Amino acid sequence: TGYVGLKNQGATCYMNSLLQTLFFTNQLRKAVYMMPTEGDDSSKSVPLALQRVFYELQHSDKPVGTKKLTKSFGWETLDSFMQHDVQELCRVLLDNVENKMKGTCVEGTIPKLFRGKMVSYIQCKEVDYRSDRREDYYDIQLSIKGKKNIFESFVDYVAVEQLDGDNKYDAGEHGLQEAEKGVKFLTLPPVLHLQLMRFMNIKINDRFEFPEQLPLDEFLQKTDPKDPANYILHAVLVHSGDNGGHYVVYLNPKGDGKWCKFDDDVVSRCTKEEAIEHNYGCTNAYMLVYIRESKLSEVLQAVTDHDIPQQLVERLQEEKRIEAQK
Ligand SMILES: CN1C(=O)CC[C@H](C(=O)N2CCC(O)(Cn3cnc4ccccc4c3=O)CC2)[C@H]1c1ccccc1
């Protein structure tokens, strides 16, 4: 295919799979390329290290290396990747970029793409007291045990939990109260990152199905008729084994349904079934990326070589020059 892969270089684990996921989030990729890293240190700037890994995956006829990126955000102990989990690596990457874009023509791009909003609420049954606290979110964590498919997870996720018995709610002035607490989606981000809670640690390999096409209007408190909350499957992040483990990701970068498996240094076309149903559950998904139907075409906009400023290309090329002292 057109696509190049990332070298295996450590217990980097899910890093390689997550790098491809962010790379084919094209609208991100092009914003990342607009960051002004011109004056930045070549060895300890994460923004500059995302630019290079992105640049390389757009230009490299050979597998791309990530040693410099690893070294930039400094996860360099023996259990650095073992100890953390996927959302965490992405928050380190996205928060670096988000901050680096502030005061550029591409400010707010990370929140625009990834940020949804949520209300968490507790209501006393017996007495008149109610707490409501809005929340932003960049990623949602879905429960998997006792759930057969994503819809049950989402249903479980908006479930009303009962605060009764010894587990009653402390309602301040009103004493210990019988109460209902739960969560509601006020909005859903153009790009929807979901984590399946398979680690409880131990790895549950149970059966859990997710759709090619994911309609989530019934989870919104207010359904927009003009922009219905329908999602398209984009990446399927895969682990096989335990403690043991291999990582790969499945992508259809264009949103079109022509899938490839991204297995580090090698990239290969595959069936939808390999990417979707074959990861339902030792080879199973732990993270899903979905793009909203209305926003598919902006997010997966075309990326030309000219979309990279030549100041950057010169810097990077220069770097490549020295390094090439073989
Ligand atoms: C087997 N195994 C190890 O030996 C070491 C860590 C390893 C791992 O790569 N992880 C990244 C992906 C995950 O982050 C998914 N996830 C995300 N958020 C969660 C929030 C709350 C509750 C659970 C979760 C959760 O499981 C897990 C940790 C883990 C693993 C476990 C399940 C699948 C694949 C690999």
Which domains does the chain possess? Answer: 5-115+294-326 (no CATH), 116-137+158-188 (2.20.210.10), 138-157+189-293 (no CATH)
Is the beta carbon of 160 within 6 A of some atom in ligand 1? no
Query: Phi then psi for 66, rounded to 5 degrees?
Result: -130, 5
Q: Tokens in use for 12?
A: 């980097």
Count of C-beta atoms within a 10 Å radius of residue 160: 10
Query: Do 295 and 229 meet the contact criterion of CB atoms below 8 Å apart?
Result: no
Is the beta carbon of 195 within 6 A of some atom in ligand 1? yes
Compute the distance from residue 91 Cα to the ligand 1 centre, in Å: 15
Count of C-beta atoms within a 10 Å radius of residue 179: 23
At residue 164, the 3 state secondary structure works out as coil
Distance (Å, whole) CA 82 – CA 88: 12
Strands (E), the chain: 116-124, 130-137, 140-143, 161-163, 169-170, 176-177, 179-185, 191-197, 213-215, 230-240, 246-251, 259-263, 266-270, 283-292
Experimental technique for the deposited model: X-ray
Give 63's DSSP letter.
P
Is the beta carbon of 16 within 6 A of some atom in ligand 1? no
Q: What is the resolution of this structure in A?
A: 2.8
To the nearest 5 percent, what fractions of the chain are helix, strand and coil? 35, 25, 40
142: part of which helix (H) or strand (E)? strand 140-143
Rg (CA), the chain: 21
Where is the chain broken, named by the residue before each break, C–N > 2.5 Å? 200, 243, 281
Distance (Å, whole) CA 123 – CA 131: 7
113: part of which helix (H) or strand (E)? helix 109-114
